[PDB]
Amino acid sequence: ATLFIADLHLCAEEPAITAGFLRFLAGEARKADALYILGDLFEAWIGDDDPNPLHHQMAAAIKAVSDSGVPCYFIHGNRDFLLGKRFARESGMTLLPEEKVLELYGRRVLIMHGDTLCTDDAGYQAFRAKVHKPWLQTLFLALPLFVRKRIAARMRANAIMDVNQNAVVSAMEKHQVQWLIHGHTHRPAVHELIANQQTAFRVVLGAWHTEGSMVKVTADDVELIHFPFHH
Amino acid sequence: ATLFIADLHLCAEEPAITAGFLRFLAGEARKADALYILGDLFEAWIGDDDPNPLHHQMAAAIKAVSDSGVPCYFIHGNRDFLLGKRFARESGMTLLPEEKVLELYGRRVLIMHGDTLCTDDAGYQAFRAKVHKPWLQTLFLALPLFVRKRIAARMRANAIMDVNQNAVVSAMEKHQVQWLIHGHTHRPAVHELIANQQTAFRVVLGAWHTEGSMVKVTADDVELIHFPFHH
Ligand SMILES: CN(c1ccccc1C(=O)Nc1ccc(S(=O)(=O)N2CCN(c3cc(Cl)cc(Cl)c3)CC2)cc1)S(C)(=O)=O
Ligand SMILES: CN(c1ccccc1C(=O)Nc1ccc(S(=O)(=O)N2CCN(c3cc(Cl)cc(Cl)c3)CC2)cc1)S(C)(=O)=O
Ligand SMILES: [Mn+2]
Ligand SMILES: [Mn+2]
Ligand SMILES: [Mn+2]
Ligand SMILES: [Mn+2]
């Protein structure tokens, strides 16, 4: 199967989640055709030059997957939009655009983090628009690391709005798909809807905390799977 | 794996759900070690003498699973507590008590429909207590079929309360388990909790409508899986 995960929100303060992720990478992921990480892999990102040991540990673990013959891909989330080409190289991941149609076993599937669908959160969308400006990213990344951390602390100190259903249909009609997989909203579920005047499905991943979750796609099956961290 | 499903609420008026169930029985179920149906297989049951064609269709489909070498088991729900030894024989299913500990790959797992945990719904628990009296079941079943239908229509005409968390811990301590699988509440989820002063897990199945759901247990994994009806 092809696997999709999102919303791991990895951080030093939550080692149980990291352990769960390492188990997933060392086991489940090795049997996959490909692995797609649809954003919020990390709880925060202020640049690829950050010496946070968790980053290099995760890079090595993800690179082990692609080195074993399982291609890995990443779409940015709202937490980790500054994850860059250096980390992608270190982790063996291919960076994808914010919205991407895959051809999976003949099925067209739209993938994204999901935050672009949450059009009712005006405050979040204003934030997203600003921090996605390349010139501002470049300027931020040019600050001293210690300053970026001070900004981050305040910004992190400074409930996730669910998707707008019209935005969902709009996106699925734009991309001409009957399948959409995303995360962001932390509301794991399978939804049936109508797009392109045909039955359509939206499959939502969950955040990693007590459980992990993944979506498995094969030719004949699409499954949303939750698993507790019980090892 | 060993499979668990619940809350299919099968009825003539919802053929899409029946089709989804037939696909599950003809495919997924055949690969299983065993199949456990944890109640609310049917939307209603007024006795095994009911000539509803759906009942015989489902009996044949379930019996095909056990005849292929996959043992099937049933725990009653609140909808189908009158499902009896005749239907069990016709369907090749073994009837289990309302609460049962399984030994699955060395792991003790408590299974039940889930309604016994919903102790905050006084009206439901009063109903359950009365209709579980064997003498009343026997008397009801002795009514003419057409009368049972008239009673049923009114009773069906006459939101599901979630579990009581204390009832959960109580049950898991009573049965000395760290794992519980149930349905009834139509809130599919994986929960972590504490029972027997140790980490415990409660895995909840969902109702069948737009999606099906199952729990898969192997030696190393416990998974809650949702799948859309997309065939
Ligand atoms: C949904 N989320 C939001 C809702 C509303 C508004 C914002 C968010 C949100 O994602 N905030 C958020 C996202 C990431 C981060 S961070 O990784 O610490 N970091 C990202 C990089 N930042 C940054 C980027 C630019 Cl180019 C310019 C500047 Cl000066 C600063 C600093 C903050 C800090 C905060 S939430 C509740 O999860 O925070
Ligand atoms: C959670 N549910 C309840 C909540 C509160 C109270 C009751 C229920 C509930 O399960 N009701 C319910 C359950 C089954 C059925 S039924 O299958 O049509 N049928 C079952 C058999 N009945 C019956 C049994 C005895 Cl031995 C005596 C009598 Cl004279 C009657 C008739 C009704 C009809 C109604 S819910 C909302 O799903 O109905
Ligand atoms: Mn997230
Ligand atoms: Mn997000
Ligand atoms: Mn039910
Ligand atoms: Mn029930």
- CATH code of the domain covering residue B154: 3.60.21
3-state secondary structure of A109: strand
Q: What is the tally of structural domains in chain A?
A: 1
Written as one letter, the residue type at A84 is: G
Cα distance between residue B207 and residue B10, in whole Å: 10
Distance B141 CA to ligand 5 centre (A): 22
Written as one letter, the residue type at B83 is: L
B196 assigned to some structural domain: no
Cα distance between residue A168 and residue A122, in whole Å: 17
Pairing of strands A189-195, A198-204: antiparallel
DSSP A20-84: HHHHHHHTGGGGSSEEEE-S-SBS--S-TT---HHHHHHHHHHHHHHHTT--EEE---SS-TT--
DSSP A159-221: -PPPPPHHHHHHHHHHTT-SEEEE-SS---EEEEEEETTEEEEEEE---SSSEEEEEEE-SS-
Reported resolution, Å: 1.6
| Residue A108 touches chain B, beta carbons under 8 Å | no
Size of interface A-B (CB pairs under 8 A): 55
- Give the closest residue (by CA) to ligand 1 atom 36: A160
Handedness of CA B11, B16, B17, B18 (dihedral sign): positive
Q: Which of B179, B207, B181 is closest to B193 using CA atoms? A: B179
Structural domain boundaries, residue B20: 2-96+121-158+205-228
- CATH code of the domain covering residue A167: 3.60.21.10
Please list, in sequence order, all residues whose beta carbon lies within 8 angstroms of the beta carbon of residue A224, skipping any fewer than 6 positions away: A188, A189, A190, A203, A204, A205, A213, A214, A215, B225, B226, B227
* Contact assignment for B227 to A223 by CB distance below 8 Å: yes
Written as one letter, the residue type at B87 is: F
* Of B201, B223, B230, Cβ closest to residue A222: B230
Question: Tokens standing for A128?
Answer: 């997203």
Q: Which of B77, B45, B223, B95 is closest to B160 using CA atoms? A: B77
B47 assigned to some structural domain: yes
B181 assigned to some structural domain: no
B139 assigned to some structural domain: yes
Residue A103 is classified by DSSP as E
* Helix (H), strand (E), coil (C) string for chain B: CEEEECCCCECCCCHHHHHHHHHHHHCHHHHCCEEEECCCCECCCCCCCCCCHHHHHHHHHHHHHHHCCCCEEECCCCCCCCCCHHHHHHHCEEECCCEEEEEECCEEEEEECCHHHCCCCHHHHHHHHHHCCHHHHHHHHCCCHHHHHHHHHHHHHCCCCCCCHHHHHHHHHHCCCCEEEECCCCCCEEEEEEECCEEEEEEECCCCCCEEEEEEECCCCEEEEEEECCC
* Of B221, B228, B231, Cβ closest to residue A190: B228
User: Which of A147, A155, A158 maximizes ligand 1 atoms within 8 Å of its Cβ, making it the mutation to test the pocket?
Assistant: A155
User: Which of A131, A138, A150, A187 maximizes ligand 1 atoms within 8 Å of its Cβ, making it the mutation to test the pocket?
Assistant: A131
Cα distance between residue B230 and residue A196, in whole Å: 16
Decide whether any atom of ligand 1 lies within 6 Å of the A151 Cβ.
Answer: yes
Distance B41 CA to ligand 6 centre (A): 9
